[PDB]
């Protein structure tokens, strides 16, 4: 349901992004206001990602 997969690797930028690496799966809490970043949590944390940079698994 909340269930993503990351498309590429996101080296975190600012203190509230999360590093994600390729092919990992994520859980969305939400997104910001414009939908360009997105809040998931993953087996290494939680914070900020950009949206386009994950999409939904089953």
Same mark, same amino acid.
């Given at each position: 349901?909340?269930?993503?997969?990351?498309?590429?690797?996101?080296?975190?930028? %600012?203190?509230?992004?999360?590093?994600?690496?390729?092919?990992?799966?994520?859980?969305?809490?939400?997104?910001?206001?414009?939908?360009?970043?997105?809040?998931?949590?993953?087996? *290494? %944390?939680?914070?900020?990602?950009?949206?386009?940079?994950?999409?939904?698994? *089953?």
């Amino acid at each position: 349901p909340n269930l993503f997969v990351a498309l590429y690797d996101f080296v975190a930028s %600012g203190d509230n992004t999360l590093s994600i690496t390729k092919g990992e799966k994520l859980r969305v809490l939400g997104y910001n206001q414009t939908g360009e970043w997105c809040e998931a949590q993953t087996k *290494n %944390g939680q914070g900020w990602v950009p949206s386009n940079y994950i999409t939904p698994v *089953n």
